[PDB]
Design a protein around this ligand. Structure first.
Ligand code: 402
Ligand code: SF4
Ligand code: SF4
Ligand code: SF4
Ligand code: SF4
Ligand code: FES
Ligand SMILES: [Mg+2]
Ligand SMILES: [Mg+2]
Length: 580
């Protein structure tokens, strides 16, 4: 068929939208509510407006190309309409970018500047309390910034299929929010933060723990430990104009030291701990030929999904604490034992790519003798904001190392941040354990990648076992509802709530749709972790020298005794009750 766009003739066979065809051919068309191959069907934003001869103004984002179409994307009428839409949005938008947390990477401000739009009447509510919801331990809503674009709703539907984010009718006005406008924590919401990642403005954000960290740092008697998740070192550079896929581990260590933290550890050490415990548990279930299957329990989003939809599986989840919580528990017990610090004066902070980790850290029972395992969790974005507010020249910093007592990590722990990393590491350790060997073939590429559901057969002690990696909460729903769990006997199943793994976490740096279309952020971010694992000498969790010392001199045998007593956390279904 033949297409004419801005006077240029194309002869094509594709069956696609005007927007996608124009972007494939370097023709600029604006867009806002279109994301994840979906737009806001009920109140289209119409910023992708184009003129089609014989039809009039159409939305390029959901209008398929067809033979004989003559399109104009830059006429005075088209730009007039788009600017009118942006002005109408500003009419409901508190346009005060100074203190806004999306000041530096906001799609809406970009469009406003592009079209020189201005509100017909400035939106200036002087009682913001009715527009804000800070009840959640993980999420926060600021509806003075909400464009009602629907990208959060669509993203929740696609990534989790829970539809916990919904359009609501509050006092005859349309808002976005949780079921019955409740606190997200009190619903089936997973707190995964994918809605945040899909928001083009500062309407949805993470629950800030920055004041916690500041107060702890400024308290004279507090010894503030900091430890970052695997994915942080593969991601934060994006917010300092360093590009995608840049390993900035040493820069992060140096920046953390410059921010005043008293000890620089690493959550990958806790990942090696979790692998110790989980591989021991798996080898035991194997030698006992049950119980099966065993689910990972390190992803709090998947933990909430199980609690809210599949309580019958809670008993099959590993009792090992997640890397964050296991690290914190050890930080309040073993670390004082090798340092002399009063355990009550230790304040443990984690840097996570995740908003659900905030909920996990504040679980009432995630403490001991009155000491929280983890006292504060800040997202990648939060750490970036802290670094910039301190005017630390991150991109120019020299590399430093972490304190090794709880900062060393193997490649097994290094790849935790990618989908299938936990399973690969656990297999690396479990095969050696069960066969009492030091096997050299350790790479399990079969469980890697962005496939939603990845199954594999593995040979351990010359018996065959079936493992599955569930990559995304929606894929968990598909795996369960489909009956796939019953096609064969599964023995060890990894589950991540965020497709691609923690590298695509809800607390990660925002990426504009164009950059997303030109870069596979999931793959490029996981590339850093897999390279680290490639170039590490210790690639099995149980080879971590610092962790081996910790277990030999303090915790003892993993999976039992003091180790099980302190480093484990068993989820349990709620007892039968009536009514509900
Ligand atoms: N706790 C923990 Fe994990 C580890 O180590 C992070 O820190 Fe993850 C990441 N990156 C996050 O958020 S959680 C689930 N297991 C995979 S990786
Ligand atoms: S959301 Fe964007 S346009 Fe609105 S105040 Fe924040 S930076 Fe400015
Ligand atoms: S919260 Fe963000 S993504 Fe959701 S409707 Fe409002 S502006 Fe759009
Ligand atoms: S946190 Fe996750 S489950 Fe909850 S509304 Fe947002 S995307 Fe949906
Ligand atoms: S996959 Fe990682 S970032 Fe996403 S909810 Fe689970 S732990 Fe958090
Ligand atoms: S981008 Fe097409 S209607 Fe919003
Ligand atoms: Mg549509
Ligand atoms: Mg201090």
């Amino acid at each position: 068929k033949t297409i004419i766009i801005n006077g240029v003739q194309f002869n094509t066979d594709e069956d696609t939208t005007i927007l996608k065809f124009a972007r494939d051919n370097n023709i600029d068309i604006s867009a806002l509510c279109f994301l994840n191959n979906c737009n806001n069907d009920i109140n289209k934003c119409e910023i992708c407006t184009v003129e089609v001869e014989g039809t009039g103004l159409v939305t390029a984002c959901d209008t398929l190309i067809e033979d004989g179409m003559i399109i104009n994307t830059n006429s005075d009428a088209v730009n007039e309409k788009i600017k009118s839409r942006i002005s109408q949005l500003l009419d409901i938008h508190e346009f005060k970018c100074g203190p806004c947390n999306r000041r530096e990477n906001c799609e809406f401000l970009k469009l406003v500047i592009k079209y020189k739009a201005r509100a017909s009447k400035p939106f200036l509510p002087k009682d913001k309390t009715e527009y804000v919801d800070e009840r959640s331990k993980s999420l926060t809503v600021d509806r003075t910034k909400c464009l009602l674009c629907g990208r959060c709703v669509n993203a929740c539907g696609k990534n989790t299929e829970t539809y916990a984010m919904k359009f609501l009718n509050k006092n005859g006005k349309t808002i976005i929010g949780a079921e019955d406008e409740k606190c997200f924590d009190d619903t089936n919401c997973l707190l995964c933060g994918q809605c945040i990642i899909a928001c083009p403005v500062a309407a949805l954000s993470e629950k800030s723990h920055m004041d916690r960290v500041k107060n702890a740092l400024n308290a004279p008697e507090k010894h503030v430990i900091v430890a970052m998740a695997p994915s942080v070192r593969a991601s934060i550079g994006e917010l300092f104009n360093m590009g995608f896929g840049v390993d900035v581990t040493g820069k992060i260590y140096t920046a953390l030291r410059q921010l005043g933290f008293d000890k620089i550890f690493d959550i990958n050490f806790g990942a090696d701990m979790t692998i110790m415990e989980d591989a021991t548990e798996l080898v035991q279930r194997i030698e006992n030929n049950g119980p099966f299957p065993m689910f990972t329990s390190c992803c709090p989003g998947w933990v909430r999904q199980a609690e809210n939809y599949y309580p019958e599986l809670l008993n099959n989840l590993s009792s090992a604490k997640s890397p964050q919580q296991i690290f914190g528990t050890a930080s309040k017990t073993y670390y004082p034992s090798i340092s002399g610090l009063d355990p009550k004066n230790v304040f443990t902070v984690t840097v996570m790519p995740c908003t659900s980790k905030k909920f996990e850290a504040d679980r009432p029972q995630m403490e001991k003798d009155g000491l929280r395992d983890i006292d504060a969790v800040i997202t990648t974005r939060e750490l970036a904001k802290m670094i910039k507010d301190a005017k630390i020249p991150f991109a120019k910093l020299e590399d430093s190392e972490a304190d090794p007592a709880m900062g060393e990590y193997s490649g097994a722990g290094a790849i935790f941040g990618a989908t299938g990393g936990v399973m690969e590491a656990a297999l690396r350790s479990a095969k050696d354990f069960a066969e009492n060997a030091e096997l050299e073939d350790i790479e399990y590429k079969q469980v890697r990648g962005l496939n939603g559901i990845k199954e594999a057969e593995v040979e351990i002690n010359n018996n065959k076992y079936n493992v599955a990696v569930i990559n995304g909460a929606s894929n968990l729903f598909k795996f369960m509802k489909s009956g796939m769990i019953n096609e064969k006997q599964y023995h060890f199943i990894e589950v991540m709530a965020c497709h691609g793994g923690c590298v695509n976490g809800g607390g990660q740096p925002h990426v504009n749709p164009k950059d997303l279309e030109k870069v596979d952020i999931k793959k490029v971010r996981a590339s850093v972790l897999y390279n680290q694992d490639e170039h590490l000498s210790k690639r099995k969790s149980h080879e971590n020298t610092a962790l081996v010392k910790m277990y030999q001199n303090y915790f003892g045998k993993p999976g039992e005794g003091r180790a099980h007593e302190i480093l484990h956390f068993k989820y349990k279904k709620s007892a039968w009750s009536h009514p509900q």
